[PDB]
């Protein structure tokens, strides 16, 4: 199992990290910690570097770095805490849909169950509420469930029965008998190992890996400067040990996130089916556990703008469960694994 580094990804990451270090970070301690949606302040950096063509393969005139490039982009966006202007477009692009839409509804499991599509009259209607990753009054891509079938549905703004929950963060969209046709179905969201859903989960897992890594960096540095009882905080075992444990989880998360992207790219070019679930569920738990520990290690300053941790703290609140609760993702992964042990 060769794990030595690839130059092409190394350049990509270096160019993202340098470019994103310029992006201005939102200065509040309340309200949204980032500007989300396809048109955030990091959108400019991504466009310059041609992020639209990263996952594009050798065929059809694309860079040819596969999902792994998408995972690298998402990790650096999370690390910078500058917002994610990439995930919604990259989901749309993987299905041939035009950009510009917020995506919503991934938090429910089974996939799409927060917005149910009922066959009624001579039609179908969407009913439920969903969390959005972008502006809730714009166009939407909704994970919806029709008769047990998980589907991604395009909804144009101002549609009947659609109300936008603006002002809470993340934003929320509500559907009261919002009508849809089979023409609005952008694609299916099944568990195929290389489908749009699996790619979407690995991008989100990489984002959570970035957010968690970014918070750890702050705590490790602040524990190196701050002194109490004439010792660096980092020389206190009750501080160093939790930061070290957070390091293990970050490296364990890196391992399954990149393994997941590599398996997907190998299939485009055994335990393959649950790799996206695995990557997302351990990243969501890792982000939650790393952030708790970082807040405690940095004391009351972690809750104030003296540090910068408050941005990652607010992000983990909204992002750790955006694509499903870890406990539920694990049960899906465990069911699949127990299936294999039965046949």
């Amino acid at each position: 199992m060769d794990l030595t580094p690839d130059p092409l990804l190394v350049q990509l990451r270096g160019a993202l990290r340098t470019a994103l270090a310029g992006v201005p970070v939102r200065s509040g301690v309340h309200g949204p910690p980032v500007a989300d949606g396809p048109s955030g302040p990091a959108r400019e950096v991504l466009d310059r570097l041609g992020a639209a063509d990263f996952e594009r393969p050798a065929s059809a005139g694309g860079l040819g770095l596969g999902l792994t490039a998408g995972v690298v982009v998402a990790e650096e966006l999370g690390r910078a805490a500058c917002g994610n202007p990439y995930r919604a477009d990259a989901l749309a692009a993987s299905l041939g849909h035009p950009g510009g839409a917020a995506s919503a509804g991934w938090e429910a499991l089974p996939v799409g169950a927060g917005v149910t599509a009922t066959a009624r009259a001579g039609g179908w209607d969407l009913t439920g509420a969903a969390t959005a990753d972008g502006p809730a009054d714009g166009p939407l891509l909704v994970a919806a469930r029709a008769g047990g079938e998980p589907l991604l549905v395009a909804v144009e703004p101002g549609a009947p029965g659609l109300t936008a929950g603006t002002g809470c963060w993340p934003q929320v969209v509500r559907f009261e008998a919002t009508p849809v046709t089979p023409a609005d179905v952008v694609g299916a969201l099944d568990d195929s190992p290389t489908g749009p859903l699996a790619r979407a989960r690995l991008r989100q897992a990489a984002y959570l890996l970035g957010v968690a890594d970014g918070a750890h960096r702050i705590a490790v540095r602040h524990a190196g400067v701050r002194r109490q009882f004439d010792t660096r905080l980092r020389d206190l075992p009750a501080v160093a040990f939790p930061l070290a444990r957070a390091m293990v989880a970050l490296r364990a998360t890196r391992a399954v996130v990149y393994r997941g992207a590599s398996l997907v790219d190998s299939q485009d070019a055994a335990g393959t089916g649950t790799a996206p679930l695995v990557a997302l569920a351990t990243a969501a738990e890792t982000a939650r556990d790393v952030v708790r520990s970082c807040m405690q290690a940095c004391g009351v300053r972690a809750m104030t703008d003296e540090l910068g941790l408050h941005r990652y703290f607010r992000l983990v609140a909204a992002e750790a469960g955006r694509y499903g609760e870890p406990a539920a993702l694990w049960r899906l992964a465990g069911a699949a694994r127990l299936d294999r042990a039965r046949r």
Binding site: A129, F229, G299, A317
Partner: protein
């Protein structure tokens, strides 16, 4: 061992519950509850509570109390939080600053300063932490240079709560500097309007904001030095030890677990995935309630067991943090959009949670205290 309350206690408790549920108090509570990063003025609410005689029932009558036992005041504290009253001001004014004055103040200082606190007309913050002295409180640098009979105060206090709404500050200062780390420390009750005081806000992720307090030769009367001069370090930790019960965190965890159950029950049914957590948290809540009253029964008899107090603080604050983290994921997207009342308190709970294992002694300090019982 009686795991439960007498009939006399529950008659008291239900009277206090009724007093807290009049239309006037409910209106004041609603105008005063912090949410969405906002920290409203609650002085009008606290005056209503003072007028009803509920702020310091355990204090002597000469100071505005009712001379009830400490356990009657825990009943009141529990019912205060269960009625929606924001309790940070009560904890800081009555349970820390007021308690210190009763424990270490002269009969004059108690007369001159305590009655307004018991009536809800004046309030006090706690000004110990300094930029270089958090867990290591003995590294404080604020100096109290004598000035005739009085003193002037220079230093910086940071991370206190409610300070821009309060009138008094309990301040730790070096009266005799250079006499050692844990020597020559004194406690002063500082008027926050006095010259040279600069209160300002450090933004905090939570609803209630932190504060920086600036003392530039702040003049303080000699009668405003509480307790024996230069004996502040043993007095200060004696007082912190008496205030440690875990009850305040128990009631947060209770409020937050009940809010999550309300959110769950306000949405159409079995909720199979939440059942284990609801069970464990309810069980740990019951353990935490007993651990808190284990401290109060001991305090009421006049014995201060610092290990037991440290157990209760650790268990309740870690429990309250765990409940806040899990409960914040329970309201559905529709409930967040519509600002269901439980979604609002749970959003606040999440952003309060990190502080619980840090205030009034960190989790790590509690474990250190606990290690002395070996």
């Amino acid at each position: 061992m009686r795991y439960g309350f007498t009939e006399e206690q529950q008659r008291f408790r239900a009277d206090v519950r009724q007093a807290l549920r009049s239309a006037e108090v409910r209106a004041a509570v609603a105008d005063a509850t912090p949410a969405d990063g906002v920290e409203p003025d609650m002085r009008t609410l606290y005056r209503l509570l003072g007028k009803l005689g509920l702020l310091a029932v355990h204090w002597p009558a000469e100071f505005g109390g009712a001379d009830r036992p400490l356990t009657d005041a825990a009943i009141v504290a529990e019912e205060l939080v269960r009625a929606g009253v924001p309790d940070t001001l009560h904890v800081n004014t009555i349970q820390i600053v007021g308690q210190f004055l009763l424990m270490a103040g002269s009969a004059e200082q108690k007369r001159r300063h305590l009655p307004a606190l018991a009536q809800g007309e004046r309030f006090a913050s706690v000004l110990y932490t300094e930029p270089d002295a958090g867990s290591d409180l003995g590294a404080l640098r604020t100096v109290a240079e004598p000035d005739g009979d009085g003193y002037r105060l220079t230093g910086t206090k940071v991370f206190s709560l409610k300070t821009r709404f309060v009138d008094l500050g309990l301040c730790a200062a070096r009266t005799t500097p250079g006499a050692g780390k844990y020597q020559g420390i004194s406690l002063f009750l500082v008027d926050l309007t006095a010259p040279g005081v600069t209160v300002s806000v450090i933004p905090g992720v939570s609803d209630e904001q932190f504060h920086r307090v600036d003392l530039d030769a702040v003049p303080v009367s000699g009668d405003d030095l509480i307790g024996a001069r230069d004996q502040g370090w043993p007095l200060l930790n004696e007082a912190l030890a008496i205030e440690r019960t875990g009850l305040d965190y128990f009631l947060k965890a209770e409020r937050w677990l009940e809010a999550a159950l309300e959110a769950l029950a306000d949405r159409d049914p079995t909720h199979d995935a939440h059942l284990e957590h609801i069970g464990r948290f309810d069980g740990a809540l019951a353990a935490d309630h007993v651990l808190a009253w284990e401290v109060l029964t001991g305090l009421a008899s006049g014995r201060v067991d610092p290990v037991t107090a440290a157990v209760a603080k650790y268990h309740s604050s870690e429990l309250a943090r765990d409940v806040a983290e899990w409960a914040a994921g329970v309201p559905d997207p529709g409930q967040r959009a519509d600002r269901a009342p439980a979604a609002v308190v749970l959003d606040s709970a999440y952003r309060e949670a990190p502080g619980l294992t840090l205030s009034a002694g960190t989790s790590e300090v509690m474990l250190q205290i606990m290690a002395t019982a070996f």
